[PDB]
Ligand binder design. Structure first.
Ligand SMILES: NC[C@@H]1O[C@H](O[C@H]2[C@@H](O)[C@H](O[C@@H]3[C@@H](O)[C@H](N)C[C@H](N)[C@H]3O[C@H]3O[C@H](CO)[C@@H](O)[C@H](O)[C@H]3N)O[C@@H]2CO)[C@H](N)[C@@H](O)[C@@H]1O
Ligand SMILES: NC[C@@H]1O[C@H](O[C@H]2[C@@H](O)[C@H](O[C@@H]3[C@@H](O)[C@H](N)C[C@H](N)[C@H]3O[C@H]3O[C@H](CO)[C@@H](O)[C@H](O)[C@H]3N)O[C@@H]2CO)[C@H](N)[C@@H](O)[C@@H]1O
Ligand SMILES: [K+]
Ligand SMILES: [K+]
Ligand SMILES: [K+]
Ligand SMILES: [K+]
Ligand SMILES: [K+]
Ligand SMILES: [K+]
Ligand SMILES: [Mg+2]
Ligand SMILES: [Mg+2]
Ligand SMILES: [Mg+2]
Ligand SMILES: [Mg+2]
Ligand SMILES: [Mg+2]
Ligand SMILES: [Mg+2]
Ligand SMILES: [Mg+2]
Ligand SMILES: [Mg+2]
Ligand SMILES: [Mg+2]
Ligand SMILES: [Mg+2]
Ligand SMILES: [Mg+2]
Ligand SMILES: [Mg+2]
Ligand SMILES: [Mg+2]
Ligand SMILES: [Mg+2]
Ligand SMILES: [Mg+2]
Ligand SMILES: [Mg+2]
Ligand SMILES: [Mg+2]
Ligand SMILES: [Mg+2]
Ligand SMILES: [Mg+2]
Ligand SMILES: [Mg+2]
Ligand SMILES: [Mg+2]
Ligand SMILES: [Mg+2]
Ligand SMILES: [Mg+2]
Ligand SMILES: [Mg+2]
Ligand SMILES: [Mg+2]
Ligand SMILES: [Mg+2]
Ligand SMILES: [Mg+2]
Ligand SMILES: [Mg+2]
Ligand SMILES: [Mg+2]
Ligand SMILES: [Mg+2]
Ligand SMILES: [Mg+2]
Ligand SMILES: [Mg+2]
Ligand SMILES: [Mg+2]
Ligand SMILES: [Mg+2]
Ligand SMILES: [Mg+2]
Ligand SMILES: [Mg+2]
Ligand SMILES: [Mg+2]
Ligand SMILES: [Mg+2]
Ligand SMILES: [Mg+2]
Ligand SMILES: [Mg+2]
Ligand SMILES: [Mg+2]
Ligand SMILES: [Mg+2]
Ligand SMILES: [Mg+2]
Ligand SMILES: [Mg+2]
Ligand SMILES: [Mg+2]
Ligand SMILES: [Mg+2]
Ligand SMILES: [Mg+2]
Ligand SMILES: [Mg+2]
Ligand SMILES: [Mg+2]
Ligand SMILES: [Mg+2]
Ligand SMILES: [Mg+2]
Ligand SMILES: [Mg+2]
Ligand SMILES: [Mg+2]
Lengths: 119, 88, 101, 73
RNA sequence: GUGGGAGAGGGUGGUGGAAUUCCCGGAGUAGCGGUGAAAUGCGCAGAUACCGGGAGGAACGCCGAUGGCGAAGGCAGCCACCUGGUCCACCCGUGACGCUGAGGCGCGAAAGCGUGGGGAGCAAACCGGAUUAGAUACCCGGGUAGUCCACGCCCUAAACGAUGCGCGCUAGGUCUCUGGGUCUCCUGGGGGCCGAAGCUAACGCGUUAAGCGCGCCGCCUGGGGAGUACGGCCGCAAGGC
């Protein structure tokens, strides 16, 4: 119980899971959700539908804190990123803006063999 | 590095006559300058090989010029060596 | 003797006293290392593109000098000692290369 | 094909080697902090090559960004 | 020689931001991760996701290319110092001083060795989870040497253009890097493509020759046995010639 009413929405999307963290404008989190929070267990967490459910859960949880406008921040390239976006777009939350913050190294660290043939 | 003034100094020093930039003596002189400078560079920085190749090439060129002089005019050869102080 | 350009970025929060002291130390250290100052541009505070030392802005000094090459590096060291100096970049001066002329 | 505009043609007389001039150099950076390609800058090999170094200099001096956040999407 | 030019050519010192991991603080809750699907693993001693601060190690995103440099190996954030090669213009100087080069000497990716340091990420061996008929593998979670620095060894390779070096001659067209000029164009050096003559078993090469010629070096002589055995030299060893 805070009554923030305006804040940020972080979408962390990977080919495995999608997970959403809604925070106050300082960056400190309020609530969060993910494909695991909904009943989905295995690979189904990577599903766009799982992402939709996740974003919606996070939004509805943040409604209870009485939040209205959000700033969307997107990270990672994964299935069901845009679906999470569209989910938050009309959740009843006003989406003020969207930004892709995905971290790209300037080539610091040798990737796992999985991600190699790159740096 | 090597400034124009030093270069002109050694040229006019070893020039066989006024206006001579190209004589064997002048060439050997200039090369000796570059060689000594590079060796003093390579006492420190002794892990720099790419330059050491250049040193090798310069030494070679000098030895060929000196050889030529020695063949044509042994007097000028001796004089040049004594003036430079080569041969160790 | 070569012609360089010293860039110095210091704390924007400095009151005129501390600032004057810093510029004083810059002059001092400069003369100590034998650099003649051809000209100077004080650009004051400007808005950095990224936070430096947690501060969103910075104060800019630019000196076009002429100094013995051998000690240039040795100069920068000294200039970086002061806490209030958050950036030092020394650059060999170059004739301007104009585009779209 | 980048038929919108070239950064060189959209600009006047200026010095490529001046790292302190932001209001020009900024035009050579993308929506993100990235240096633009020859397609966008309309420069030449030599020109672009000098632009790169001066831009990097400006970056270190704190005048230009290394990176930025992508708006919209 | 004088005057100019371009470059990730080399060595030393300093320095910049992005990211990964770890630590500290805030906020926050039931999972995160991973896969074809999973499980091991991590998480209620509060992880994942988010903000802030700090430590350290390694590599330099965009520029960036079909680009540039180097004899080869190879070279990429930025700054300064030291230093090698090279190209053009002038037509100034010496006067055949040239080319090649057995042996010698130096350089020589990665892996590997010795001593000391360092250790973030990655990762032989190894410990587990899967898959499978089995799986001493591919996939997943960990992880030591090592990868990094200094000093000294090692001397190998699909060390490749699978094309030794130098010089002369033999249509052009086109793209490009880099100089000069009376700057549509001409001229010089370098990197590509298509092609005259010619060559080639063919594929293809074709002023960057695999064409026409001269000089000098290295090498080949059916396949397996075999880059083995013996001897010698080199090496701390692995092993090399
Ligand atoms: N070499 C390092 C680099 O040099 C760049 O610039 C280099 C080149 O552009 C410049 O060229 C010089 C110049 O005097 C002019 N263009 C002609 C001259 N022959 C060249 O000098 C050349 O020959 C001499 C030996 O005589 C070498 O010592 C030197 O390394 C070499 N560049 O000399 C500089 C040093 O070699 C930039 N400073 C930077 O990229 C970096 O420091
Ligand atoms: N750091 C600049 C470079 O340093 C080289 O040598 C330096 C580095 O290779 C070496 O590593 C140092 C290390 O001593 C010190 N204890 C920690 C420091 N972070 C390291 O410095 C470097 O480490 C690696 C490259 O090795 C880089 O990724 C990193 O950005 C850089 N900081 O330390 C040397 C100096 O003590 C060469 N001089 C040349 O490449 C260049 O000047
Ligand atoms: K290339
Ligand atoms: K071993
Ligand atoms: K021109
Ligand atoms: K044919
Ligand atoms: K072909
Ligand atoms: K050999
Ligand atoms: Mg999953
Ligand atoms: Mg030769
Ligand atoms: Mg300081
Ligand atoms: Mg270099
Ligand atoms: Mg270097
Ligand atoms: Mg960091
Ligand atoms: Mg914590
Ligand atoms: Mg784990
Ligand atoms: Mg673990
Ligand atoms: Mg437990
Ligand atoms: Mg457990
Ligand atoms: Mg509990
Ligand atoms: Mg604990
Ligand atoms: Mg436990
Ligand atoms: Mg974490
Ligand atoms: Mg942090
Ligand atoms: Mg540590
Ligand atoms: Mg690239
Ligand atoms: Mg003449
Ligand atoms: Mg004559
Ligand atoms: Mg030879
Ligand atoms: Mg030999
Ligand atoms: Mg080796
Ligand atoms: Mg090694
Ligand atoms: Mg070792
Ligand atoms: Mg050790
Ligand atoms: Mg690992
Ligand atoms: Mg593994
Ligand atoms: Mg196993
Ligand atoms: Mg089977
Ligand atoms: Mg060991
Ligand atoms: Mg090849
Ligand atoms: Mg070829
Ligand atoms: Mg080639
Ligand atoms: Mg050839
Ligand atoms: Mg040969
Ligand atoms: Mg030759
Ligand atoms: Mg050509
Ligand atoms: Mg090339
Ligand atoms: Mg052809
Ligand atoms: Mg024919
Ligand atoms: Mg044919
Ligand atoms: Mg070749
Ligand atoms: Mg030929
Ligand atoms: Mg043989
Ligand atoms: Mg052979
Ligand atoms: Mg036989
Ligand atoms: Mg055999
Ligand atoms: Mg063998
Ligand atoms: Mg025998
Ligand atoms: Mg034997
Ligand atoms: Mg022995
Ligand atoms: Mg063995």
């Amino acid at each position: 119980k805070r009554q923030v009413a305006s804040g940020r929405a972080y979408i962390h999307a990977s080919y495995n899971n999608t997970i959403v963290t809604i925070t106050d404008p300082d960056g400190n989190p309020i609530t969060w959700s993910s494909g695991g929070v909904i009943g989905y267990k295995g690979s189904r967490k990577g599903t766009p539908y799982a992402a939709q459910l996740a974003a919606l859960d996070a939004a509805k949880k943040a409604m209870a804190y009485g939040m209205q406008s959000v700033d969307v921040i997107v990270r990672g390239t994964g299935a069901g990123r845009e679906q999470a976006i569209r989910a938050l777009q009309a959740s009843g939350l006003q989406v003020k803006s969207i930004v892709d913050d995905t971290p790209v190294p300037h080539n610091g660290c040798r990737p796992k063999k999985k991600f190699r043939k790159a740096s | 590095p090597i400034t124009k003034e030093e270069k002109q100094k050694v040229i006019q020093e070893f020039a066989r006559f006024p206006g001579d930039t190209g004589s064997t003596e002048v060439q050997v002189a200039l090369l000796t300058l570059r060689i000594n400078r590079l060796s003093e560079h390579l006492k420190v920085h002794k892990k720099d090989h790419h330059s050491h190749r250049g040193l090798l090439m310069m030494v070679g060129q000098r030895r060929r010029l000196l050889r030529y002089l020695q063949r044509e005019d042994p007097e000028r050869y001796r004089a040049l060596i004594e003036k430079l102080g080569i041969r160790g | 003797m070569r012609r360089y350009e010293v860039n110095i970025v210091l704390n924007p929060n400095l009151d005129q006293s501390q600032l004057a002291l810093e510029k004083e130390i810059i002059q001092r250290a400069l003369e100590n290392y034998g650099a003649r100052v051809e000209k100077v541009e004080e650009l004051g505070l400007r808005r950095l593109a990224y936070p430096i030392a947690k501060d969103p802005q910075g104060y800019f000094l630019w000196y076009q000098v002429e100094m013995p090459e051998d000690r240039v590096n040795d100069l920068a060291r000294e200039l970086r000692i002061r806490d209030n100096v958050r950036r030092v970049m020394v650059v060999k001066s170059q004739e301007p290369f104009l585009a779209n002329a | 094909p980048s038929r919108k505009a070239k950064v060189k043609a959209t600009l006047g007389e200026f010095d490529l080697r001046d790292y302190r001039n932001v209001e020009v150099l900024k035009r050579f950076l993308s929506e993100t902090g990235k240096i633009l390609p020859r397609r966008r800058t309309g420069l030449s090999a030599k020109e672009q090559r000098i632009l790169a170094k001066t831009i990097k200099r400006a970056r270190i001096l704190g005048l230009l960004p290394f990176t930025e956040k992508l708006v919209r999407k």
